[PDB]
């Protein structure tokens, strides 16, 4: 539907599914997976060449994941612009590139005139929605304007009445090109090209369609996995994390440490902290965690895998979760069903405790709550109150029962 290039993963390769059969050359340095993700690295052989058929107002869309700046190389990050995708014929065409937290789209007509349009994301947020996380880019061009959309929403709109005819016949090269660091890479997914200027409506629909999966995602946007170490993030308490309380079978809530060095330009909260959790299947064939799956939520206490429990019979709306070694106790529940109450794209998920798989009886959802001692302290909890709230439309992203799982990732160092 107005699509003239559709790069998708087939048979360990990248193929044009547009119907026009552009040829696609995937060199040895490009890592590929069956989640349609490909990685461009610093290597000379990390490159993709596609040749458009010549017998063919335009738009480019794709998902991208850009690693975090190194806390050592901020100056290079802010100043060294580098190409990722270039499309030049007779010194004319287009090009996407990155300089730090800025992704930029440039045009250059037949005379060599230039305009550009960028999206820059914040590099001082405690928790960022963009840094090293999958997000959706769409770039549209017509007679007068170049617009950039991020996750379906308009972010930039530069005027280009100056810029006229530009050539898009040329070969499209996917390749990191500039004064990049050795460790620089970029992940990309679902690259497409359209012979029309997409509307905000089309772009937002594509965003929802390409977000949908049967499975849950991790904090980074990748599929959520069984048997993999995760730190836990709460979207209703962004700067808080869970820690097993010394000499008590409960998880206390603490405040995240932050970046603690001398840079005017950057700030973030630490992500690799709190207990190392891990999800285990409750069996009834890949390691992907799907919506409505029944799971055990565990964590590592020294060299012991412990488990997250709830009392079967507690009085109030809320009760502190019970953290303890793996064992069968008919005083506690241990089975969790992982949910997705959000209709809209999110990397949040929710955690429901139930009596049994077959029972429609719901105990409550995992969240964070203030409790009174003798003072007032947050604890890792279950609450019955979440049960009605998650049914409300539109879904409430800021609820404490929204959790995200953060595995160690090479795009994020702290």
């Amino acid at each position: 539907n107005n699509i003239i290039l559709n790069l998708r993963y087939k048979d360990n390769n990248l193929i044009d599914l547009s119907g026009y059969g552009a040829k696609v050359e995937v060199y040895d340095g490009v890592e590929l997976n069956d989640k349609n993700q490909f990685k461009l690295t610093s290597s000379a052989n990390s490159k993709i060449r596609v040749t458009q058929n010549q017998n063919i107002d335009f738009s480019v869309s794709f998902w991208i994941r850009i690693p975090k700046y190194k806390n050592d190389g901020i100056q290079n990050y802010i100043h060294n612009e580098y190409t990722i995708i270039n499309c030049m014929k007779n010194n004319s065409g287009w090009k996407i590139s990155i300089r730090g937290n800025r992704i930029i789209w440039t045009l250059i007509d037949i005379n060599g005139k230039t305009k550009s349009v960028f999206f820059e994301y914040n590099i001082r947020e405690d928790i960022s929605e963009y840094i090293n996380r999958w997000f959706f880019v769409t770039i549209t061009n017509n007679l007068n304007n170049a617009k950039i959309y991020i996750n379906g929403k308009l972010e930039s709109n530069t005027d280009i009445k100056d810029i006229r005819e530009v050539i898009a016949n040329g070969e499209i090269i996917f390749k990191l090109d500039g004064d990049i660091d050795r460790t620089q890479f970029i992940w990309m997914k679902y690259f497409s090209i359209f012979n029309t200027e997409l509307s905000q409506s089309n772009i937002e629909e594509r965003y929802k369609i390409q977000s949908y999966s049967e499975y849950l995602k991790d904090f980074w946007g990748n599929p959520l996995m069984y048997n993999k170490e995760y730190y836990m993030f709460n979207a209703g308490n962004k700067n808080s994390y869970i820690k097993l309380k010394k000499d008590s079978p409960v998880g206390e809530i603490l405040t995240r440490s932050k970046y603690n060095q001398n840079s005017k330009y950057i700030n973030y909260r630490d992500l690799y902290i709190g207990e190392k959790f891990i999800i285990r299947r409750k069996s009834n064939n890949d390691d992907i965690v799907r919506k409505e799956d029944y799971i055990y939520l565990d964590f590592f206490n020294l060299n012991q895998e412990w488990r997250v429990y709830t009392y079967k019979y507690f009085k109030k709306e809320e009760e502190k979760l019970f953290l303890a070694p793996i064992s069968d106790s008919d005083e506690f529940y241990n089975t969790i069903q992982i949910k997705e109450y959000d209709e809209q794209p999110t990397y949040s998920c929710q955690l429901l405790f139930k009596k049994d798989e077959e029972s429609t009886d719901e105990i409550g959802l995992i969240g964070i709550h203030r409790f009174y001692e003798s003072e007032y302290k947050d604890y890792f909890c279950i609450s019955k109150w979440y049960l009605k709230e998650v049914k409300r439309k539109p879904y409430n992203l800021k609820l404490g029962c929204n959790w995200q799982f953060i595995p160690k990732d090479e795009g994020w160092t702290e």
Partner: nanobody
């Protein structure tokens, strides 16, 4: 609630040693047991893992056929039987109690900083 290694020793190539992994405070009836070893200052590596049921075992390729992992629920201890020992087996051995063997080898236990472990050395 402690999970402690013992049975390490100093031996000659070809000889045998038996490590035990003793659980206190809890019971291994629900636990899959993994062994790891770390030589100074090489990369730490997964050595073996036995299932909760005890009917399935996994081995590092370089120890298969020499090492036998087993688990005795009634004693709450699991074992690494090490036969035909070689110099390359020299390491500090650590154990962990897991829900499941899946993914065991790439778990990031900070044994160096809080591990106890038991020392194994092989030299002719």
């Amino acid at each position: 609630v402690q999970l402690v290694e013992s049975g390490g020793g100093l031996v000659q190539p070809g000889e045998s040693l038996r490590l035990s992994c003793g659980a206190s405070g809890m019971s291994l009836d629900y636990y899959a047991i993994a062994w790891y070893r770390q030589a100074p200052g090489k990369e730490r590596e997964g050595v073996s893992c036995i299932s909760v049921s005890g009917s399935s075992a996994q081995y590092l390729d370089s120890v298969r056929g020499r090492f036998i992992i087993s688990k005795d629920n009634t004693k709450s201890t699991a074992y690494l039987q090490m036969n035909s020992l070689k110099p390359e087996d020299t390491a500090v051995y650590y154990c962990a109690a897991l829900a499941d063997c899946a993914g065991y080898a790439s778990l990031t236990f900070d044994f160096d900083s809080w591990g106890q472990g038991t020392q194994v050395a092989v030299s002719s």
